Design a protein around this nucleic acid. Structure first.
Ligand code: GTP
Ligand code: MG
Ligand code: ZN
Lengths: 50, 731, 120, 248, 125, 149, 54, 422, 99
RNA sequence: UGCU
């Protein structure tokens, strides 16, 4: 994203099992790296590196 | 509405039925009149475009005609009879807005700065975009699907349009047409078109060693068969002809009229057509070597059809349909109705043409069966997001492709768009490269008579093509001269011809819009006089000094002369793409060298209307300018001085709009400063609070409270209370 | 429907629509005219009638549709565009109105005045 | 990675020629495993990688050489006794290109899939002269077939593999030593490996179908993996080898 | 065979040799004259309307210019398409309504084209 | 092609030398330079393009093709292979770009835009196919990857 | 080469008569006996020595 | 570049104007001629010229195949019919050259015979291209068709008397529609039949080697003196140009030429309505020196007034009676009064105050700005100054005009003082 | 993005609002940078747009100068109030029972 | 038709 008018979707699970699976498997703290080559994608960005 | 409608009426002036001879319906003169509304009870009343928008009706004028017919063998005439309603374009010759001052515009509830030029039907504003297609009656040499370098020609006359191709799939030239069962050799067609001597055929094709070596296989394949006479060739063509000596007659008819319709034959004299196919085969042979393949994206071979030609074709088709319906009704009524003599007035449908035009302008889908043309998206809703948005949408251009394939060829920016179309203005998305906008300074030519052009060409020593054989076509100094795809003849020392033609055009005896180009690779001088061609004004430069001077500019500023006087005094002239391809142009005065023929008027005119708002665009990137134009097409601001009385389904206005501080000459010209679409704010480039990480910005609470950025959204909610068939109404 | 219809009724409907489009009356007027024509054709006396009878029926249905909306239209022009004579026109008009009994609003004077003044 | 790649150009792999399809189109062709691919590349090693003479020799051996490309002139001479086509081979250019082609080799190449010309029709008079005297076949063909012979004779293969179209000598200038290899834009790996002087043990090809049909399914898998890895590295983006291994 | 020019052609036809030669020149559609008592109109004036005698002069200036002074205006004569095929000039005179005579006058080798000097016609007025 | 390659090499050398000179003359504390050093956004290439000189406008990995007959624009002589006539941009964004340079830059930009537009759909289709083909495999407990069957 | 009949102009083919090979047309009795040697060279472009790449 | 030498004369001949034709062979090079080929006859027509030459070719030459000649003769003709034979003997002896018409009109083409010091021009009555025609093949095809028919009929040894009486198959001469009749008229068969309807004319051939050739070659010349002034061919270059190119048939819509083509009064009126400020010398220079100064003065005095030596267009000329203010919509009379007041203020003093003018005329700022810009410019710290300087030359040259303008301005001042109550 | 045109526009607008003028940003021309720098140095402001600015939060001056100036910002029709969406159960389609 |  670039915060230039992007419309993003937000969904709310309707089941406790689905909620737990989303929190565990799709956790932001657990998916800090991509399975392509293991490089971290969630890191510093412009206005933070500088 | 002034000339083309009259020409169509003259072409379809007389209509009669086969049964009951001596009966006819003759049209004398057709009128469009002024815009009126059929609201009152059989009474006309002037109606304004704003009133039409408010009442959700069409802004059209009653089409009337004076006719004469024979009811019972007694000629009865009518001086004024309505037959339809033609939607009148705003700011046209017959529109009520033209020739009006701002005070009268205010009285009529219309903005003076409104660009106009759009139709109003059922309350919605539709604009007919400019269609961009390929030039007709032109040979195109290109690679085939598998990669066979062949040629094609789409001969389009006022009646039929036929595309015929020529391939070298097997080392020999096979001609393919939609009316033949199988592609036949070109030598058989040569023998059928009168020229039976193989020596003459080879001399017409060419006298070069490689030309003969490449054409040998065709002669061998022709000699393999027993085809040596015109009769045998025509019999073979007839046997190969598809169903729609009788076969020989049909073959001759297809060779004379169907194949290469643009090449005329005086009386079954195929000399011109033979020379044309010989030149085509010569071009194909020359291209079979060095890969000098012509490109389709070259706008010098493009034609722009404005709304005028589309409306003329639609009106012609509707008038033909009406004539056919009237003839059918007559054939059905007159022979068995009663002794009461029948006349057309009782069945003259006055709503046919009206509904046809209304649907063609509203739905946007045009289906002309007489020409087999099925187009869509011709008309689009005028975007009233802002004055800039409307002014930029009014000058758009759609392509014939219409997102068929991601070719990238026509979508790429070709150097031929110099001074004609805006390079940076293009919608960002799937339509990138297919939707374009005209430049700030450009013009579209119309059709001329072509009489004096041919007369001057014949008087300048152009030798008749029928007087000499085709061997002269293979000489290096003999240059062919073409006129709108038709072989005008041959000439020697084409420099003198071009110079004299340009001098005559500058003098004024020839229309300034007739273009003349010369291609040396093929040795062809093209004289273009058809409409739709893009032209641009240029100052004439002679001997390292332009013709326009400070004295002329001072006279223009004081009002002694005008642009027409400049055109007449051989100071500024219109150049086409094909003409500038050969002529040399200079950007500035310091760039003028010895080899210069013209001078650029202004460089900033290269950009379009939407791009003219960019301050200092030559200091930014191209994608930046593209996104800037795309967002200016949606910018929020005032629309016009009648924005309060205007009622649209969705409108966005700004509370305190302010004109830019850094305004461009294009802005001053388009008068955007009078209707700005933004505000100037004291911006500080810096990072603050980290809430502006990726393209975001931080606003001031107090600034927003003091009225900065205040916007107004106006929506419309419409309701209808109509009466049904029964005597009941919604209440 | 549209299948249990005779060629004569279809010709009558097409003539109604043609005269409506010639007079340039709205599609609501066209619908009302075709509806009244069907309602009149329902009867057998008008069903098995003369050709001039059914032509005057088309004319009178158009006239009734024009009157029902307070629209001025002269019976003279109606007869002129209908290929009929005033005598038989009035006779069949009286017959059909006595057979049906539909509302016949009187012709307003001001509307006809405006319609005729627009002609000059 | 398909979206990350921008489909750049000018990536000739250091040869400044032989435009090869790399990127999303190449990945598409690989995942489709088409029998015929666009611009196939075969890389072959040499036993004598330092001798440019031997490199050229094997190049001429593997590359298709047409008759018209080596013959200096072909003339259809009609002597008052008989008509025949005389081809003059340029022995100078032959020895310059280092092609083992003589009059006997040209005669043997002729009479192969050419309207069934009998051996007695072709004859040799000098050291570099070839005389072809056709005969009427009676199948809608008469003595006037010398034109078809002039049309299709110069395009007859005399030496090299018919499938090979263009073989070039690539050079690796490693500081240790400058070695030579063969880059063939053909679709025949079996013939390239069978040719003399080519180290068939270190011959690779880009056509997965040919690699499968020649060296087996494991060779095809290895070639697919290597090609995908190379195509992905050309764009500067890396992928774990396990993904391509699982795909293959 | 190098492409010759009209001035050198006339020079080598008159000075280098004295044998007569048959030429074929293409004149403009309308000549700068009026049909003399031909019942009119500004119509086309061709050679069929003019009478016999001296009608114009042929001048050869320096630098290879070849002009034709046919009155107050001056046309320019250039070399036409170099025809290499056989061209036989013949006169077919039908002296009698039943029998005529075809007389081969000579052969045509060179072709000339006369064109109005539009530049001069424009700069004059 | 040899002349083309030599001209491109000369232009690249000029570009690199101009960029090096700009980087050596620029003083520290400069915001563009600091951002290019830290890698947050921008780079030395963009800095040199917007300060020192813009690089050669390359279309499909080559110079601007001749749109007109034997020349890109009518403003240049025929058969002219000069850098400024074939696509070289001598001026920088700060000093302003000439009309021809701006037109060539717009050509390159539109080329890149259409390339990305085609790439979007092409990679979408490729990803759809690859996923529909590989959505059946899974890692079992016995360390053996098996399909659905 | 490509030869044509001076009489009609059609292509001439090489055939064998009763005395010597001759050019003849397929649409007229015109013929032309061969007296001396006749040749038609084409000089096909030779394959240049492709130099090493790199 | 002067005519140093080669001053050749041009003469015209009309002896063979209607008897001169141009025959050219596109398939025969100029090297080989038909002077040695014996000709037999030539078929021609007066109208729709299409000549067909019938020549003879040798047979004993080595370039002729006797077997193929016999074959083609037996194919085109019968065994011994010889009633309608394309060849007298059993060999191809005659050759047929057909003529094709290049153009309909050949008046622009002329044959030029060059002699020592003179060039004789003779018009051409027709130009035709001669090419070897192939009709013996069509006749052979017809012969083969009739032979196949005869074979089909004689398939049996003895053919019984066939009862194939021709029933009366008289079809209707149906009335052909106009479209079908036009199609039939434009069909190739109809044109061919119309051309064939005209009878042929046979002519003998006289080669160049004959004495008749040199006898008739002299008719291309004309008896006349060396120097004769032609009565015709005396039109000027402008007349020749008009002949060879005959014609087809804001307030600045009219161009300079369209303006000059109008009367002097309309010219001056349009120039004033366009510029609104121009000296008399500039007006004279624009109109032209051929127009009289008194006429220009009489024309300008009716549509302009004198202000500080310069001429300013009147207010009513710019604002007609039916016009109105494009910014406020006030009637044209008020605009005329305001413009007259502005002109009076300018004549009284070179510096005019916009605020004072507005306060006096009670007009709006935009109208005052337009009135001031029409005839003045903005000067800092001084207000509005007249765009042109004081022209005293015209005042000194025309004193009576100055007095007339002064009294007119006095009357206008009286009217303004009466209206605005100054 | 190499948007030096934005900086040039900002400097020109600052000079214009200071000197009571309207600078021109005409393509391939317009007011040069030297003219606006002269205007700024005549009016007393920095010739590069950067001015001494004090932080409002901490009240201490910033180590680097801030680039202030008037820029012509234009608001677009894309509104978050219109683009915001939240779907409960809501209705469904007749053919396929889905939102 | 626009948006990312
Ligand atoms: N606002 C808007 N306008 C559209 C839309 N789709 C089509 N139009 C109009 O229709 C034209 C092109 O639409 P098309 O893609 O041809 O319509 P389509 O091909 O049927 O698109 P599909 O419905 O996806 O097949 C445009 O140029 C618009 O005129 C749309 O989705 N939104
Ligand atoms: Mg985004
Ligand atoms: Zn022949």
């Amino acid at each position: 994203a670039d915060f230039d008018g992007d419309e993003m979707n937000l969904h709310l699970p309707q089941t406790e099992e689905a909620k737990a699976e989303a929190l565990v498997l799709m956790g932001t703290k657990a998916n800090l790296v991509t399975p392509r080559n293991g490089e971290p994608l969630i890191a510093a960005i412009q206005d933070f590196l500088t | 509405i002034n000339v083309e409608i009259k020409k169509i009426m003259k072409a379809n002036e007389k209509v009669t039925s086969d049964a009951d001879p001596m009966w006819y319906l003759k049209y004398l003169n057709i009128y469009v009149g002024l815009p009126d509304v059929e609201e009152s009870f059989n009474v006309t009343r002037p109606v304004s475009p704003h009133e039409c928008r408010l009442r959700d009706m069409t802004y059209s004028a009653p089409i009337t005609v004076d006719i004469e017919y024979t009811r019972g063998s007694q000629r009865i005439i009518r001086n004024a009879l309505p037959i339809g309603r033609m939607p009148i374009m705003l700011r046209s010759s017959n529109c009520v807005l033209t020739g009006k001052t701002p005070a009268e515009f205010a009285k009529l509830n219309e903005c003076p700065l409104d660009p106009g030029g759009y139709f109003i039907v059922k309350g919605v504003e539709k604009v007919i975009l400019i269609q961009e297609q390929l030039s007709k009656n032109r040979i195109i040499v290109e690679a085939d699907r598998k990669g066979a370098v062949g040629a094609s020609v789409t001969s389009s006359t006022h009646e039929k349009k036929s595309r015929t191709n020529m391939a070298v799939k097997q080392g020999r030239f096979y001609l393919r047409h939609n009316t033949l069962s199988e592609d036949i050799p070109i030598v058989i067609i040569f023998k059928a078109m009168g020229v039976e001597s193989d020596q003459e055929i080879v001399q017409m094709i060419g006298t070069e060693e490689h030309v003969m070596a490449a054409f040998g296989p065709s002669l061998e394949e022709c000699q393999k068969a027993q085809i040596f006479t015109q009769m045998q060739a025509l019999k073979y063509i007839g046997n190969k002809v598809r169903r729609q000596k009788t076969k020989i007659e049909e073959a001759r008819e297809l060779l004379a009229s169907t194949i290469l319709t643009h090449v005329p034959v005086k009386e079954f004299n195929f000399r011109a057509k033979c020379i044309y196919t010989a030149v085509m085969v010569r071009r194909v042979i020359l291209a079979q070597g060095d890969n000098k393949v012509d490109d389709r994206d070259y706008y010098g071979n493009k034609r722009l059809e404005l709304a005028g030609q589309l409306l003329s074709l639609l009106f012609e088709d509707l008038f033909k349909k009406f004539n056919s319906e009237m003839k059918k009704i007559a054939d059905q009524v007159i022979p068995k109705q009663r002794a009461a003599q029948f006349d057309v007035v009782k069945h003259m449908r006055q709503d046919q043409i009206t509904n046809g035009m209304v649907n063609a302008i509203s739905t946007g889908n045009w289906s002309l069966k007489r020409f087999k043309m099925d187009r869509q998206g011709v008309t689009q809703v005028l975007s009233r997001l802002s004055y800039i948005s409307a002014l930029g949408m009014m000058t758009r251009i759609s392509s014939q492709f219409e997102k068929t394939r991601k070719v990238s060829g026509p979508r790429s920016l070709q150097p031929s768009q110099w001074g004609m179309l805006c390079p940076s203005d293009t919608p960002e998305g799937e339509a990138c490269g297919l939707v374009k906008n005209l430049a700030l300074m450009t013009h579209i030519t119309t059709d001329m008579e072509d009489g004096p052009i041919v007369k001057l060409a014949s008087n300048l020593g152009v030798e008749d093509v029928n007087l000499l054989c085709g061997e002269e076509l293979s000489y290096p100094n003999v240059f062919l001269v073409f006129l709108n795809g038709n072989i005008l003849g041959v000439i020697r020392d084409h420099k003198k011809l071009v110079n004299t033609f340009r001098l005559m055009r500058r003098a004024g005896y020839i229309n300034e819009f007739v273009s003349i180009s010369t291609n040396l690779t093929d040795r062809c001088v093209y004289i273009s006089s058809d409409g739709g061609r893009l032209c641009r004004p240029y100052i004439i430069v002679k001997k390292q000094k332009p013709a326009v001077t400070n004295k002329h500019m001072e006279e223009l500023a004081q009002g002694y002369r005008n642009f027409e006087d400049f055109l007449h005094e051989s100071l500024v002239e219109y150049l086409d793409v094909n003409e500038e391809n050969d002529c040399n142009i200079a950007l500035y005065e310091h760039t003028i060298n010895k080899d210069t023929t013209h001078l650029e008027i202004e460089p900033f005119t290269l950009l379009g209307v939407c791009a003219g708002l960019i301050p200092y665009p030559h200091h930014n990137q191209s994608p930046r300018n593209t996104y800037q134009c795309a967002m200016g097409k949606q910018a929020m601001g005032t629309i016009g001085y009648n924005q309060r009385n205007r009622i649209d389904t969705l409108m966005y206005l700004l509370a305190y709009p302010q004109k830019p501080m850094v305004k461009t000459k294009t802005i001053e010209l388009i008068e955007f400063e009078k209707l700005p679409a933004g505000q100037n704010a004291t911006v500080a480039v810096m990072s603050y609070s980290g809430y502006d990480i990726e393209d975001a910005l931080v606003l001031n609470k107090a600034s927003l409270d003091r009225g900065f950025g205040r916007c107004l959204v106006y929506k419309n909610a419409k309701c209808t209370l109509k009466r049904y068939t029964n005597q009941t109404f919604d209440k | 429907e549209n299948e249990q219809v005779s060629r004569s009724q279809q010709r009558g409907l097409r003539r109604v629509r043609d005269l409506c489009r010639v007079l340039q009356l709205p599609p609501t007027f066209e619908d009302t005219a075709v509806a009244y024509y069907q309602q009149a054709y329902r009867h057998s006396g008008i069903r098995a009638a003369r050709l001039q009878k059914k032509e005057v029926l088309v004319g009178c249905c158009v006239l009734i549709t024009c009157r029902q909306h307070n629209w001025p239209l002269t019976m003279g022009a109606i007869c002129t565009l209908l290929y009929a004579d005033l005598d038989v026109f009035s006779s069949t008009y009286m017959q059909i109105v006595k057979l049906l009994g539909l509302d016949v609003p009187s012709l307003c004077l001001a509307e006809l005045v405006k319609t005729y003044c627009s002609s000059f | 990675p398909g979206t990350q790649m921008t489909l750049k150009t000018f990536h000739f792999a250091g040869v400044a020629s032989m435009n090869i399809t790399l990127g999303v189109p190449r990945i598409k062709e690989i995942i489709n495993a088409s029998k015929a691919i666009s611009t196939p590349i075969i890389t072959a090693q040499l036993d004598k990688d330092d001798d440019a003479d031997y490199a050229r020799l094997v190049k001429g051996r593997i590359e298709k050489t047409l008759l018209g490309e080596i013959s200096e002139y072909i003339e259809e001479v009609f002597l008052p006794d008989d008509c025949f086509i005389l081809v003059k081979l340029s022995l100078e250019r032959i020895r310059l290109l280092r092609l083992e082609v003589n009059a006997e080799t040209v005669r043997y190449s002729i009479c192969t899939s050419k309207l069934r010309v009998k051996p007695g029709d072709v004859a040799v008079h000098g050291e570099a002269v070839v005389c072809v005297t056709p005969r009427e076949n009676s199948k809608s063909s008469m003595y006037y077939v010398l034109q078809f012979l002039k049309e299709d004779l110069p395009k007859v293969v005399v030496q090299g593999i018919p499938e090979v179209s263009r073989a070039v000598i690539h050079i690796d200038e490693q500081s240790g030593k400058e070695k030579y290899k063969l880059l063939v834009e053909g679709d025949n790996l079996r013939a390239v490996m069978a040719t003399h002087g080519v180290k068939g043990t270190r011959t690779t090809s880009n056509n997965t179908y040919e690699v499968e049909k020649t060296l087996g399914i494991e060779a095809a898998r290895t070639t697919i993996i290597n090609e995908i890895q190379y195509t992905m590295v050309n764009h500067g983006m890396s992928i774990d080898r396990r993904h391509v291994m699982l795909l293959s | 065979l190098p492409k010759d020019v009209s001035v050198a052609e006339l020079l080598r036809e008159l000075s280098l040799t004295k044998e007569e030669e048959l030429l074929f020149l293409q004149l403009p559609d309308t000549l700068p004259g009026q049909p003399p008592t031909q019942d009119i109109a500004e119509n086309a004036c061709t050679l069929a309307d003019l009478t016999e005698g001296q009608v114009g002069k042929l001048l050869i200036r320096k630098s290879g210019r070849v002009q034709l002074l046919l009155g107050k205006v001056t046309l320019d004569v250039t070399m036409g398409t170099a025809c290499s095929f056989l061209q036989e000039l013949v006169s077919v005179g039908l002296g009698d309504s039943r029998t005529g005579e075809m007389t081969v006058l000579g052969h045509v080798k060179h072709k000339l084209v006369c064109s109005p000097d539009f530049e001069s016609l424009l700069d004059h007025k | 092609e040899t002349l083309e390659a030599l001209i491109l090499k000369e232009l690249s050398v000029i570009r690199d030398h101009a960029g090096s000179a700009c980087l050596r003359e620029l003083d520290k504390s400069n915001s563009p330079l600091t951002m290019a050093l830290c890698g947050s956004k921008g780079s030395f290439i963009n800095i040199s393009q917007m300060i020192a000189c813009v690089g050669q406008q390359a279309i499909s990995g080559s110079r601007v093709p001749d749109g007109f007959e034997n020349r890109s624009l009518p403003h240049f002589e025929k058969h002219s292979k000069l850098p400024a006539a074939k696509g070289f941009v001598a001026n920088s964004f700060y000093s302003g770009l000439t009309p021809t340079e701006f037109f060539f830059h717009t050509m390159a930009g539109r080329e890149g835009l259409v390339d990305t537009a085609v790439k979007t759909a092409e990679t979408g289709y490729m990803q759809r196919r690859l996923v529909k083909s590989l959505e059946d495999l899974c890692s079992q407990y016995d360390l053996t990857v098996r399909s659905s069957t | 080469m490509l030869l044509f009949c001076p009489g009609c102009g059609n292509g001439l083919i090489v055939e064998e008569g009763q005395r010597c090979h001759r050019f003849a047309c397929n649409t007229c009795p015109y013929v032309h006996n061969i007296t001396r040697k006749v040749t038609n060279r084409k000089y096909p472009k030779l394959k240049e020595v492709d130099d090493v790449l790199g | 570049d002067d005519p140093v030498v080669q001053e050749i004369d041009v003469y015209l001949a009309k002896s063979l104007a209607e008897k001169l034709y141009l025959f050219q062979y596109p398939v025969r090079p100029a090297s080989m001629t038909y002077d040695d080929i014996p000709h037999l006859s030539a078929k021609i027509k007066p109208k729709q010229q299409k000549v067909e030459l019938e020549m003879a070719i040798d047979t004993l030459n080595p370039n002729y195949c006797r077997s193929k000649g016999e074959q083609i003769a037996l194919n085109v003709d019968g065994a011994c019919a010889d009633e309608t034979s394309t060849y007298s003997s059993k060999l191809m002896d005659k050759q047929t050259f057909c003529s094709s018409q290049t153009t309909s009109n050949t008046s622009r083409y002329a044959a030029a015979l060059y002699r020592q010091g003179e060039l004789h021009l003779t018009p051409l009555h027709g130009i035709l291209q001669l090419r070897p025609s192939f009709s013996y093949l069509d006749k052979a095809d017809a012969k083969h068709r009739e032979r196949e028919a005869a074979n089909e009929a004689g398939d049996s040894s003895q053919d019984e008397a066939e009862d194939d009486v021709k029933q009366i198959t008289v079809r209707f001469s149906r009335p052909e529609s106009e479209q079908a009749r036009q199609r039939r008229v434009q069909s190739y068969e109809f044109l061919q039949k119309k051309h064939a309807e005209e009878p042929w004319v046979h002519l003998h051939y006289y080669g160049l080697r004959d004495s008749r050739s040199e006898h008739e070659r002299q008719y291309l010349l004309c008896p006349g003196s060396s120097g004769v002034e032609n009565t015709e061919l005396v039109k000027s270059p402008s007349e020749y140009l008009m002949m060879l190119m005959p014609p087809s048939q804001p307030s600045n819509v009219l161009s300079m030429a369209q303006l000059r083509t109008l009367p002097l009064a309309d010219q001056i009126k349009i120039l004033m309505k366009n510029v609104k400020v121009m000296p008399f010398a500039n007006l004279m220079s624009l109109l032209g020196p051929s127009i009289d100064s008194v006429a220009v003065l009489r024309g300008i005095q009716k549509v302009a007034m004198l202000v500080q030596g310069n001429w300013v267009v009147k207010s009513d000329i710019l604002y007609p009676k039916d016009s109105s203010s494009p910014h406020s919509g006030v009637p044209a009379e008020v605009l005329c009064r305001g413009r007259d007041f502005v002109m009076w203020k300018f004549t009284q003093s070179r510096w005019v105050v916009r605020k004072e003018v507005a306060t006096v005329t009670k007009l709006c700022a935009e109208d005052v700005k337009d009135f001031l810009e029409h005839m003045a410019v903005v000067r800092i710290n001084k207000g509005w100054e007249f765009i042109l300087p004081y022209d005293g030359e015209f005042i000194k040259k025309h004193p009576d005009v100055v007095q007339r303008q002064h009294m007119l301005w006095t009357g206008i001042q009286a009217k303004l003082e009466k209206v605005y109550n100054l | 993005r190499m948007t030096v045109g934005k900086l040039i526009e900002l400097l020109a607008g600052k000079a214009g609002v200071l000197d009571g003028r309207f600078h021109y940003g005409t393509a391939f021309g317009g007011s040069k940078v030297k003219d606006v720098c002269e205007d700024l140095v005549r009016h007393g402001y920095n010739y590069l747009g950067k001015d001494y600015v004090t932080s409002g939060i901490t009240g201490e001056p910033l180590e680097a100068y801030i680039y202030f100036g008037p820029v012509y910002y234009q608001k677009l029709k894309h509104m978050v109030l219109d683009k915001m969406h939240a779907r409960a159960r809501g209705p469904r389609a007749v053919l396929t029972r889905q939102p």
